[PDB]
Structure 1
Amino acid sequence: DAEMAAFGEAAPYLRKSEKERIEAQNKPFDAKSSVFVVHPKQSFVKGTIQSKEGGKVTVKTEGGETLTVKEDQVFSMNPPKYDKIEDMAMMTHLHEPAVLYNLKERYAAWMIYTYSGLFCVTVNPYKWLPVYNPKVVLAYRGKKRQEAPPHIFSISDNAYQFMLTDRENQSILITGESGAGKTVNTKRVIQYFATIAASGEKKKEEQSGKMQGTLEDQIISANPLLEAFGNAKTVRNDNSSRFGKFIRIHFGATGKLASADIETYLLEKSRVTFQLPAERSYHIFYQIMSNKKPELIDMLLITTNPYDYHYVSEGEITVPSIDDQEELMATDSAIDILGFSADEKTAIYKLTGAVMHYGNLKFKQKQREEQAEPDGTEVADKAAYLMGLNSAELLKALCYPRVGVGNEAVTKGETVSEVHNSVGALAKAVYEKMFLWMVIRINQQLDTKQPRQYFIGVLDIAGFEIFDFNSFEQLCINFTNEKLQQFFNHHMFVLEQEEYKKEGIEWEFIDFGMDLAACIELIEKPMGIFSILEEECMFPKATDTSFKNKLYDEHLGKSNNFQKPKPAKGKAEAHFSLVHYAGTVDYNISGWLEKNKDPLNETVIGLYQKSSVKTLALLFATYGGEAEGGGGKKGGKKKGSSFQTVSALFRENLNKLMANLRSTHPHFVRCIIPNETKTPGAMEHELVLHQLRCNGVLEGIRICRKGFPSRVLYADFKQRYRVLNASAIPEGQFMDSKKASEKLLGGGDVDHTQYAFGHTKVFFKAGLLGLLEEMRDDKLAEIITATQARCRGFLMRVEYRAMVERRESIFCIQYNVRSFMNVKHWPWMKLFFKIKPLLK
């Protein structure tokens, strides 16, 4: 309360009033009866234990329901002291339910940031909050996470701190499902950096501030370009990230901004050509056809009605929450700031329209032949011109692909179906490349000469998602995540072990990563999936089926993580399941071989390679330089620098990454999505539960509980408990951030067993907190019983003062009555009586 001011307005969403707290922690609780329990419809609901069937349990509900469930379908419930705990990992009850429940409660209260160990859980508000508030930004500035409530800037600042304090590079790993809202965070983190450590001095003035011509802006401006090209309306989000990314913010020596570095991973090439019914393609398209810059429409030779471009109107065209017109400029302007040449800025556009046109390219069967022949030179003409090509040459290459089988170049004829498909392949190919280029070009501007001493990497990618249908793309992502996870499990193992070393506890344990090495080797190692995948790609006459068998003959029965599918449930077909940390994933191998080969009509590429549109020409260069290497039929593309695998890079890139991640001090952020239905203050259970498993959150709790569940960070320990032996615990905490907590525990009639210290934190049992209380319980009997007595004593002590006072007033009353009883019958007195009145 006193503290909170900085936020003030945000406060309510960060922390609760000091009595709201108090009114919550200090309330009646019946441990032995209060519990969490399994539940057929709702995941886990709370209840009170009624009876006990010797190994069955009957419980009441909170809604009113009675169920008799197993002994282990029943889970304890944390004392009220742990209501809306900033760090669930401090709880003395490391369960599945308690975690779900904590998140949930502090959300219904509008607190989106709750920590779960090292993580920084984040829940989609689905509404607006004063959190990103320009006041907060400062507030979180220079504060350990124990000096402030759960928030992302905490993570983000600490990184910075740590950056300069330890002289190590840092990282932030943001991860969640499609609708979790990571971009948003990522972006928000980024602003944070830019703000708190900028100072271009000259660039700071209110004169076209943030326009092209400064980075802090470039840095920023970056996003809105990428977003136009790599973002789209998903059925979950309205601006979903259809690719992954890694930015390196290169801080200087002083500590002020110096450089940036983007890298893109796994772009959703398919959107370019397809789209689900409730979705839509990349924005750009819709941006452009919006008509805010009419020249563009005529320049590209298109219309404003998307239904003229099959490729981009298979799903939806308009989204209410998006103003395509505004963005177009945003985009536009960003390009400029980004330093692109008008020409390039022209290529981009012109090139983005060609692609639309391609999808309009039509063909027909030559008569009496099964060959494809152009169905007109209306569109080709446009595509051709827009790309700096020749209509004819183009349609030929497309129709009569001139190949090179043997030591020559053999002209091959294609079918209608073959063309339509090849076209689509280029459309996608071109878009991609371009996108890649843009990134590079961005990076290029984001390159300064100033020295760099450290960087802070911000990684944004998807998390392990399980679908009834898992294809190639899923493997690639899952694999990424299963790696990332191990990356953590280790950091934690390293980390943990420091405490027990700092404190002096005697705990031995094996790396937690190790548990996952099994799965990883199976994928990335030599006779593993990828290899078998990338070898077969060399066999001119291999089949998905072929590949499949090779997969089995070699891994089946011999490998544990390897399994043959469970074809039924919500799944669509059979091929192979894997046993990832998050669970079993059923993978379908169909298209892999192809997808992995990235087959492109080289004749056409030829044309690109010699376009009048330099940029287009450029994008293709690297294909043109490896052809030397795969001159004759069969063989190896790599000889000339051409990719041999769809997967060959992914790995290379994923390695270059995980390596960059190592020379880093990992900082974790887990983004969460409350309800599919888009409702603030709500949460489907099992939906959040899922995420938690695949997040790493539930695995961090596990590793924590091995053991000594709740683990308190030292400052977080000082503040909250100094008050217990106030003098001696405060001194300890202040005198040595760690040594303090040590010193503190000096007092209390508590089990000096139940805990254990170490380099970054204390370890504590539960049934520990349970132990604590008990001691406490006895200590009040003392306190009370004694306080009762005095009272009791004192109580009667006042009775004597009254008894005594009364002493005479009674007598007076006593005797006085007696008189009368005697008198009232006496003549003389009756006389006086009748007579007493006549007097005066």
Structure 2
Amino acid sequence: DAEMAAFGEAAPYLRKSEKERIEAQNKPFDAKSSVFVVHPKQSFVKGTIQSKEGGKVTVKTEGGETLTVKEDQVFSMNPPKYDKIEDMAMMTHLHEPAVLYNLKERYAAWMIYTYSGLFCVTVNPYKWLPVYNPKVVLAYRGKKRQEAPPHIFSISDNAYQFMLTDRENQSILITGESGAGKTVNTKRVIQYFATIAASGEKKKEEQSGKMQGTLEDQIISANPLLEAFGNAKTVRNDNSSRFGKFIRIHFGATGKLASADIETYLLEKSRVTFQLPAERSYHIFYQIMSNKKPELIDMLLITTNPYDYHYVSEGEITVPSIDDQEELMATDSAIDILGFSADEKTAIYKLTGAVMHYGNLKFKQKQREEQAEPDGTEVADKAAYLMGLNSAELLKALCYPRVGVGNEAVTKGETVSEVHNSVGALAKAVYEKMFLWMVIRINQQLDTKQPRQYFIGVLDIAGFEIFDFNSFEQLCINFTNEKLQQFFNHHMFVLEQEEYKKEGIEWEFIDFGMDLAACIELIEKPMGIFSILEEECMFPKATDTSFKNKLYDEHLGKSNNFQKPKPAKGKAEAHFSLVHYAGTVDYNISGWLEKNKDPLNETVIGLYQKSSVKTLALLFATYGGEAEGGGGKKGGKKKGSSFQTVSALFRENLNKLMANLRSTHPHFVRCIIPNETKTPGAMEHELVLHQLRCNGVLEGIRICRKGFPSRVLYADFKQRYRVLNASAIPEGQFMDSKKASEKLLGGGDVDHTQYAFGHTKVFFKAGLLGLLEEMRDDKLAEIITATQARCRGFLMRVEYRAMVERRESIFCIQYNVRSFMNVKHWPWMKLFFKIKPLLK
């Protein structure tokens, strides 16, 4: 309360009033009866234990329901002291339910940031909050996470701190499902950096501030370009990230901004050509056809009605929450700031329209032949011109692909179905490349000469998602995540072990990563999936089926993580399941071989390679330089620098990444999505539960509980408990952020066993906290019983003072009455009586 001011307005969403707290922690609780329990419809609901069937349990509900469930379908419930705990990992009850429940409660109260160990859980508000508030930004500035409530800037500032304090590089790993809202955070983190450590001095003035011509802006402006090209309306989000990313903010020596570095991973090439019914393609398209810059429409040779471009109107065209017109400029302007040449800025556009046109390219069967022949030179003409090509040459190459099988170049004929498909392949190919280029070009501007001493990496990618249908793309992502996870499990193992070393506890344990090495080797190692995948890609006459068998003959029965599918449930077909940390994933191998080969009509590429549109020409260069290497039929593309695998890079990139991640001090952020239905203050259970498993959150709790469940971070320990031996615990906490907590525990009639200290935090038992209380319980009987007595004593002591006072007033009353009883019958007295009145 006193503290909170900085936020003030945000406060309510960060922390609760000091009595709201008090009124919550200090309330009646019946441990032995209060519990969490399994539940067929709702995941886990709370209840009170009624009876006990010797190994069965009957419980009442909170809604009113009675169920008799197993002994282990029943889970304890944390004392009220742990209501809306900033760090669930401090709880003395490391369960599945208690975690769900904590998140949930502090959300219904509008607190989106709750920590779960090292993580920084974040829940989608689905509404607006004063959190990103320009006051907060400062507030979180220079504060350990124990000096302030759960928030992202905490993570983000600490990184910075740590950055300069330890002279190590840092990282932030943001991860969640499609609708969790990571971009948002990522972006928000980024602003944070830019703000708290900028100072271009000259660039700071209110004169076209943030326009092209400064980075802090470039840095920023970056997003809105990428977003136009790599973002789209998903059925979950309205601006979903259809690719992954890694930015390196290169801080200087002083501590002020110096450089940036983007890298893109796994772009959703398919949107470019397809789209689900409730979705839509990349924004750009819709941006452009919006008509805010009419020249563009005529320049590209298109219309404003998307239904003229099959590729981009298979799903939806308009989204109410998006103003395509505004963005177009945003985008536009960003390009400029980004330093692109008008020409390039022209290529981009012109190139983005060609692609639309391609999808309009039509063909027909030559008569009496099964060959494809152009169905007109209306569109080709446009596509051709827009790309700096020749209509004819183009349609030929497309129709009569001139190949090179043997030591020559053999002209091959294609079918209608073959063309339509090849076209689509280029459309996608071109878009991609371009996108890649843009990134590079961005990076190029984001390159300064100033020295760099450290960087802070911000990684945004997807998390392990399980679908009834898991294809190639899923493997690639899952694999990424299963790696990331191990990356954590280790950091934690390293971390943990420091405490027990700092404190002096005697705990031995094996790396927690190790548990996952099994799965990883199976994928990335030499005779593993990828290899078998990338080898077969070399066999001119291999089949998905072929590949499949090779997969089995070699891993089946011999490998544990390897399994043959469970074809039924919500799944669509059979091929192979894997046993990832999050669970079993059923993978379908169909298209892999192809997808992995990235087959492109080289004749056409040829044309690109010699376009009048330099940029287009450029994008293709690297294909043109490896052809030397795969001159004759069969063989290896790599000889000339051409990719041999769809997967060959992914790995290379994923390695270059996980390596960059190592020379880093990992900082974790887990983004969460409350309800599919888009409702603030709400949460489906099992939906959040899921995420938690695949997040790593539930695994961090596990590893925690091995043991000493709840683990308190030192500052987070000071603040909350200083008050207990106030003088001696405050001194300890202030005098040494760590040494303090140490010193504090000096007092209390508590089990000095149940805990254990270490380099970053204390370890605590539960049933420990349970133990504590008990001791405490006895200690009040003492305190109370004694305080009762005096009272009791004293109580009667006042009775004597009254009894005594009364002493005579009674007598007076006593005797006085008696008189009358005697008198009232006496002549003389009756006389006096009748007579008493006549007097005066």
Is the TM value for this pair above 0.5?
yes
Question: Is 2:446 aligned against 1:446?
Answer: yes
Give 3-state SS (helix, strand or coil) of 2:460's partner.
Answer: strand
Q: Deviations over 1:1-30 (max 9, x none)?
A: 000000000000000000000000000000
Secondary structure class of the residue paired with 2:646 = coil
| Secondary structure of residue in 2 paired with 1:577 | strand
Tell me the alpha carbon deviations over residues 276-297 of structure 1, each in whole angstroms, 9 at most, x when there is no partner: 0000000000000000000000
Q: Secondary structure at the match of 1:585?
A: strand
1:393-404 to 2 correspondence within 5 Å?
Answer: 393-404=393-404
Shift of 1:831: 1.3
Measured after TM superposition, the shift of residue 600 of structure 1 is 0.1
- C-alpha distance in 2 between matches for 1:741 and 1:192: 31
2:799 and 2:295 mapped to 1: Cα distance?
A: 101
SS in 2 for 1:633: coil
**1:98-132 deviation per Cα after TM superposition (whole angstroms, max 9, x unaligned):** 00000000000000000000000000000000000
Structure 2 Cα separation of the partners of residues 157 and 735 of structure 1: 23
Q: Whole-Å Cα distance in 1 between the matches of residues 90 and 259 of structure 2?
A: 38
Residue 359 of structure 2 corresponds to which residue in structure 1?
Answer: 359
Partner in structure 1 of residue 735 of structure 2: 735
- Whole-Å separation in 2 of the counterparts to 1:520 and 1:603: 39
> What does residue 497 of structure 2 align with?
497
Deviation at 1:740, TM superposition (A): 1.3
In structure 1, what is the equivalent of residue 572 of structure 2? 572
CA distances 1:236-288 after superposition (whole Å, capped 9, x unpaired): 00000000000000000000000000000000000000000000000000000
**CA drift at 1:477:** 0.1
Q: Specify the alignment match of 1:721 in structure 2.
A: 721
- Deviation string 1:743-790 (CA, Å, 9 cap, x unpaired) is 111111111111111111111000111101101100110111011011
CA deviation after TM superposition for structure 1 residue 739, in Å: 1.3
> Alpha-carbon deviation of 1:454?
0.2
1:45-87 CA distance string (max 9 Å, x none):
0000000000000000000000000000000000000000000
- CA offset at residue 823 of structure 1? 1.1
SS in 1 for 2:666: strand
Further displaced range: 370-379 or 714-723: 714-723
How many Å separate the matches in 1 of 2:105 and 2:392?
66
Q: TM-score when scaled to structure 1?
A: 1.00
Q: Give the Cα–Cα distance (whole angstroms) in 1 for the partners of residues 582 and 803 of structure 2.
A: 78
Partner residue in 1 for 2:829: 829
State the partner residue of 2:772: 772
- 1:767-823 CA-to-partner distances (Å, cap 9, x unmatched) read 111101101100110111011011001100100000000000011111111111111
Cα deviations by residue, 1:559-615 (Å, 9 ceiling, x for unpaired) = 000000000000000000000000000000000000000000000000000000000
- Distance apart, 1:173 and its partner CA: 0.1
Unaligned runs of 5+ in 1: none
Q: Which moved more, 1:809-818 or 1:519-528?
A: 809-818
Q: Give deviations 1:162-182, integer Å, cap 9, x for gaps.
A: 000000000000000000000
Q: Aligned residue for 1:310?
A: 310
Q: In the alignment, which residue of structure 2 is the partner of 1:487?
A: 487
Offset of 1:423 from its aligned partner?
0.1
Deviations along 1:177-205, one digit per CA (max 9) or x if unpaired, are: 00000000000000000000000000000
**C-alpha separation in 1, matches of 2:660 and 2:710:** 32
**Aligned equivalents of 1:735 and 1:293: distance in 2?**
63
| Structure 1 residue 736, shift from structure 2 partner | 1.5
Separation (CA, whole Å) in 2 of partners of 1:828 and 1:604: 145
CA distance in 2 between counterparts of 1:732 and 1:112 reads 32
Offset of residue 424 of structure 1: 0.1
Q: 3-state DSSP class of the match of 1:794?
A: helix
- Alpha-carbon distance between aligned partners in 1 of 2:738 and 2:332, rounded to the nearest angstrom: 53
CA distance in 2, matches of 1:526, 1:703: 31
Secondary structure of the 1:511 match is: coil
The 3-state SS of whatever aligns with 2:50 is strand
- Within 5 A, what are the aligned runs for 1:273-288? 273-288=273-288
Deviation at 1:307, TM superposition (A): 0.2
Q: Which residue of 1 aligns with 2:805?
A: 805
CA distance in 1, matches of 2:651, 2:442: 24
Partner of 1:545: 545
Shift of 1:734: 1.6
CA distance in 1, matches of 2:716, 2:389: 66
CA deviation after TM superposition for structure 1 residue 726, in Å: 1.4
Query: In structure 2, how many angstroms separate the alpha carbons of the residues matched to 1:477 and 1:469?
Result: 14
SS across alignment from 1:219: helix
Give how far 1:730 is off: 1.5
- Matched residue count: 840
1:179 aligns with 2:204: no
Q: State the alpha-carbon separation in 1 of the partners of residues 537 and 565 from structure 2.
A: 24
TM superposition shift of 1:827: 1.4
The residue number in structure 2 matching 1:166 is: 166
Deviation, structure 1 residue 833 = 1.2
**Structure 1 residue 427, shift from structure 2 partner:** 0.1
**SS of match in other structure, 1:616:** helix
Cα deviation, residue 217, structure 1: 0.2
Instruction: Output the aligned Cα RMSD.
Output: 0.4
| 1:651 equivalent in structure 2 | 651
User: C-alpha separation between the residues in 2 aligned to 1:732 and 1:149?
Assistant: 21
**CA shift for structure 1 position 235:** 0.1
C-alpha separation in 1, matches of 2:783 and 2:670: 46
Q: Over residues 690-711 of structure 1, what are the superposed CA-to-partner deviations in whole Å (9 max), with x where a residue is unaligned?
A: 0000000000000000010000
Deviations 1:359-378 (A, max 9, x none): 00000000000000000000
Shift, 1:548, TM fit:
0.1
Q: Deviations over 1:491-516 (max 9, x none)?
A: 00000000000000000000000000
Distance 1:737 1:399 in 2: 73
Separation in structure 2 between the aligned mates of residue 332 and residue 319 of structure 1, nearest angstrom: 20
Distance across 1 between alignment mates of 2:33 and 2:624: 74
Q: Which deviates more from structure 2 when the two are superposed, residues 73-82 or residues 736-745?
A: 736-745
Give the Cα–Cα distance (whole angstroms) in 2 for the partners of residues 736 and 248 of structure 1: 33
The Cα of 1:407 is off from its aligned counterpart by 0.2
Tell me how far 1:317 sits from its aligned partner: 0.2
Quote the sequence identity (%): 100
TM-score, scaled to structure 2? 1.00
Q: CA deviation at 1:140?
A: 0.3
**Counterpart Cα distance in 2 of 1:164 and 1:289:** 48
Number of the residue aligned with 1:331: 331
1:146 aligned counterpart, secondary structure: coil
Alpha-carbon shift at residue 824 of structure 1 (Å): 1.2
What's the offset of the Cα at 1:839?
1.1
CA shift at 1:621, angstroms?
0.1
- Summarize deviations over 1:297-348 as a string: whole Å, max 9, x none: 0000000000000000000000000000000000000000000000000000
Deviations 1:674-729 (A, max 9, x none): 00000000000000000000000000000000010000111111111111111221
Q: How does 1:749-764 map to 2 (within 5 A)?
A: 749-764=749-764
Q: Identify the residue that residue 9 of structure 1 maps to in structure 2.
A: 9
Q: Could you tell me how far apart the structure 2 residues matched to 1:775 and 1:609 are?
A: 80
Query: Quick one: distance in 2 between partners of 1:45 and 1:268?
Result: 39
Q: Find runs of 4+ consecutive structure 1 residues off by over 6 angstroms.
A: none
| 1:631 equivalent in alignment to 2:631 | yes
1:684 corresponds to = 684
The CA distance in 1 between the partners of 2:516 and 2:458, in whole Å, is: 24
SS of match in other structure, 1:395: helix
- Match of 1:604, SS? helix
Deviates more, 1:645-654 or 1:757-766: 757-766
Q: What displacement does 1:484 show?
A: 0.1
How far the C-alpha of 1:546 sits from its partner, in A, is 0.1
Matching residue of 2:838? 838
SS of equivalent residue, structure 1 residue 2:
coil
Q: For 2:753 and 2:386, how far apart are their aligned partners in 1? A: 76
Question: Quick one: distance in 2 between partners of 1:374 and 1:827?
Answer: 147
Asked if 1:44 corresponds to 2:50, the answer is no
Instruction: Output the CA distance in 1 between the equivalents of 2:835 and 2:208.
Output: 115
CA distance in 2 between counterparts of 1:319 and 1:830 reads 108
Please name the residue that 1:244 is paired with.
Answer: 244
